[PDB]
UniProtKB/Swiss-Prot annotation:
One of its GO terms (molecular function) is nucleotidyltransferase activity. GO terms for cellular component: extracellular region. The keyword Repeat does not apply. This is Mono-ADP-ribosyltransferase C3. Its EC number is 2.4.2.-. Its main location: secreted. Residues 4-203 form the TR mART core domain. ADP-ribosylates eukaryotic Rho and Rac proteins on an asparagine residue. It is found in: Secreted. Monomer. Interacts with human RALA. NAD(+) binds at residues 37, 44, 48, 85-88, 124-126, 140-143, 169-171.
């Protein structure tokens, strides 16, 4: 099966805007999404710390998480699509925070082989929501790890760019507790990034 890869910003925005018009999100769902784009690192950080258990969160955050989850009843991709994400070294583990990058800006090759040993051809579960973009965008394309996600037709995925608090991000949000399988890992041509290819699964 082939996956749609946008290569033009205006073409991506036109497609995304068309999807967003059909969702019919409620007022409260939209509020939850806007706030998510302002506070995602904090929300996702708490979901990771507590392994997806929200019982101990403040009541307003439980409500927001519930509305974000509910929004995906309305938000599905109509086709196989490729999505993009930038991550910093901690994404790979605590052990990579201060070892992944060399002084000259290149990925350390020993750290890269350890990352492959740890993640290649294996499932990974993410407790947070996964923010992605329809293309490589400048806000995140300079991070040391770039992931290309293969997301199948009918999967939960929502273009929230129209109500994001930030410009230029072409954001497609994926649900929390998603599992993906890392199919490939390689160094970029200039040796400054790791490129990950992964197939998105469900939230089971
Ligand atoms: N990064 C992107 O590709 C991207 C794409 C579109 C929009 N956004 C926007 O950026 C903001 C969210 O940023 P984010 O995506 O970095 O937030 P995040 O919560 O996913 O990640 C925060 C930080 O933790 C790291 N991280 C992610 N998963 C981790 C894990 N399992 N263990 C340890 N560290 C982990 C990330 O690399 C990042 O440095 C929001 O405003 C969102 O709208 C980001």
């Amino acid at each position: 099966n082939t996956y749609q890869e946008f290569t033009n910003i205006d073409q991506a925005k036109a497609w995304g805007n068309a999807q967003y018009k059909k969702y019919g999100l409620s007022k409260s769902e939209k509020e939850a999404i806007v706030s998510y784009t302002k506070s995602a690192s904090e929300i996702n950080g708490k979901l990771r710390q507590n392994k997806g258990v929200i019982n101990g969160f403040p009541s307003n955050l439980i409500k927001q998480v519930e509305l974000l989850d509910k929004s995906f009843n309305k938000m599905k991709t109509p086709e196989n699509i490729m999505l993009f994400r930038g991550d910093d070294p901690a994404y790979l583990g605590t052990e990579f925070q201060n070892t992944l990058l060399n002084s000259n800006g290149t990925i350390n090759k020993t750290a890269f082989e350890k990352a492959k040993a740890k993640f290649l051809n294996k499932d990974r579960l993410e407790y947070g929501y996964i923010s992605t973009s329809l293309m490589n965008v400048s806000a995140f394309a300079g991070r040391p790890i770039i992931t290309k996600f293969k997301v199948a037709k009918g999967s939960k995925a929502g273009y929230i760019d129209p109500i994001s608090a930030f410009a230029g991000q072409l954001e497609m949000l994926l649900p929390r507790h998603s599992t993906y399988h890392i199919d490939d890992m390689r160094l970029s041509s200039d040796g400054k990034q790791i490129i990950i290819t992964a197939t998105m699964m469900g939230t089971a």
